[PDB]
Point group: D2
Chain length 116, copies 4
Amino acid sequence: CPLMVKVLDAVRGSPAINVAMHVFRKAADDTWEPFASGKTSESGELHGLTTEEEFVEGIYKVEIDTKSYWKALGISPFHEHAEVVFTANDSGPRRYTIAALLSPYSYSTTAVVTNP
Amino acid sequence: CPLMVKVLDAVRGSPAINVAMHVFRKAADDTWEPFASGKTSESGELHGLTTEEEFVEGIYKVEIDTKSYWKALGISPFHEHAEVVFTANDSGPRRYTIAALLSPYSYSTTAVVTNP
Amino acid sequence: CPLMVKVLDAVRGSPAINVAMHVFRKAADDTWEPFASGKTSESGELHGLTTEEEFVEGIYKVEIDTKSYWKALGISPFHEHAEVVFTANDSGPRRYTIAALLSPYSYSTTAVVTNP
Amino acid sequence: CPLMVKVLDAVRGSPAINVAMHVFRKAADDTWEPFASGKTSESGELHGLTTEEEFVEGIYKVEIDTKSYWKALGISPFHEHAEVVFTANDSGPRRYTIAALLSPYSYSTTAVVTNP
Ligand SMILES: COc1cc(/C=C/c2cc(O)cc(O)c2)ccc1O
Ligand SMILES: COc1cc(/C=C/c2cc(O)cc(O)c2)ccc1O
Ligand code: NA
Ligand code: NA
Ligand code: NA
Ligand code: NA
């Protein structure tokens, strides 16, 4: 899995399930080109976003729709979304896990980057 | 001060000093318009970005240049920047403090929103 | 103020007000001796816990009563408390700010250490 | 797995491998009784700490030796250890994953609690 995203709920102590996100890749004109998307599973994980051959050097943005997640729980959150912007594959392929821990007024994110 | 940003360094246990950031506001055509910018002080704080009159309802993005901060310390970090996107003042004027806690592969961010 | 603690609420986007905490110092017999205690103010800050003369080298524990805070809001939280254990002043006098960002099932904590 | 601990390194973007920890359970005299222990694997995970039958209601403390982890990397960290103190199994068995994200001057922790 070249790119996986895992989302956790800090209020309820659970995976954040059915969280939608889009992934973009920065184009030469500095616009954000659509790249991948999906929703987290019952484990809070989104696998299968891309393949090693398609996932080359670039600046990538994961835009996680945290607002819809909190709204469905009756909570008015601070952020429009949580976004994670990073350069990937600049030294050749790596495997990336992006984790996000969500609260209504806060989020934390980290990356685990592994060499295949 | 209707908007203040405070940035902390989780590696060195210090304020994150001289961190550049840019604030944008979403325009009617869904474009990000430049709104304000500045650098954190010796306390890790950036004051004076805007005024009560100028800080109208809208969707704002604070883009913190974490990459340059880490690179100046000899660290090749994961993120291009740490960004915070939020609706402001849609229920009347509020004061916002955005805090960010930085590590090379991770960041946490929260908001303190107060009604004056 | 050689030691200050600041506590923030990630659910409500506010300082965590009236949060009790107890500070202990490790005794020569490896027991935790009571050192100081107090409650956060309306700003989420607790000042005046100790003095430069009293805050000698040692191992200190700050135990923040997060459980009572959440229970007063009707939330059954995960942790009994958030605690921070650290050696202080072993290279000479320093000023310490301990910050904690609270959610029902999660907390983040950092330290800002400055040389006066 | 009734109790699993996962530890991540926010400086290097990797699992925190070979991190030692002890688990204690509060006794009737308010002393901390030894309960379980181990070291994280190459995935940053420590499995097999306990069994469902042995893991009953109590207050548990996971004490993670983060200081030795940072010292081995030549880093002088803030905390003596990271500790996570929580009541478990008060409503009967649950499965607990404790995650900790480590930086030299900061840590974040969350719990994922699932009903079998
Ligand atoms: C708002 O003013 C302050 C915030 C903080 C720390 C905020 C913080 C701490 C964390 O552990 C995580 C996080 O995302 C934010 C410290 C001193 C301040 O004066
Ligand atoms: C539980 O499983 C996993 C948790 C995480 C990340 C947890 C985490 C992330 C943060 O940004 C902050 C925090 O306190 C905890 C990553 C991979 C996993 O498989
Ligand atoms: Na390269
Ligand atoms: Na309105
Ligand atoms: Na000394
Ligand atoms: Na019960």
